[PDB]
Design a protein around this ligand. Structure first.
Ligand SMILES: Cc1ccc(NC(=O)CN2C(=O)NC(C)(C)C2=O)cc1S(=O)(=O)N1CCCCCC1
Length: 130
């Protein structure tokens, strides 16, 4: 229905706004673009599902997220990919992990404050009905 189309359009507007706020935070610059293979050739071999905030924007626009839970799975993937690829004790790796954990915690904290639980529940029920 048009009511259901209006629900998913509101979801995409909400998700673009959250993603924009993460993408403009200087701490998260490293997560804004896919890994350049000419800089990091072994990335695509080690990380089986690359994810970055530009890819999340592309996926919103392709109507790939029908719930905030599905969006948060891709934020969680950005974080787990960073922890997996940069596991060492050296400060370079520790800084990336701290930023990855901050990106995840920030996304979760925005959604906790700004997502209506009944809006998420409606999305989940339209999703389950398809
Ligand atoms: C999880 C994750 C998502 C996206 C990126 N993207 C980049 O690193 C992009 N990029 C380049 O390819 N070159 C420069 C350094 C110019 C740049 O900004 C990276 C990650 S990551 O955290 O897994 N990670 C970044 C730390 C260093 C190793 C590469 C992968």
């Amino acid at each position: 229905s048009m009511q259901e189309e209006d629900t998913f359009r509101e979801l995409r507007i909400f998700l673009r706004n959250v993603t924009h706020r993460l993408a403009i935070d200087k701490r998260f610059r490293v997560f804004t673009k896919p890994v350049d293979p000419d800089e990091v050739p072994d990335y695509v071999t080690v990380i089986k599902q690359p994810m970055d905030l530009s890819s999340v924007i592309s996926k919103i626009d392709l109507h790939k997220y029908l719930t905030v839970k599905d969006y948060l799975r891709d934020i969680d993937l950005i974080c787990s990919n960073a922890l997996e690829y940069n596991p060492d004790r050296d400060p370079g790796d520790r800084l990336i992990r701290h930023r990855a954990c901050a990106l995840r915690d920030t996304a979760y904290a925005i959604i906790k404050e700004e997502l209506d639980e009944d809006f998420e529940q409606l999305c989940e029920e339209i999703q389950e009905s398809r």
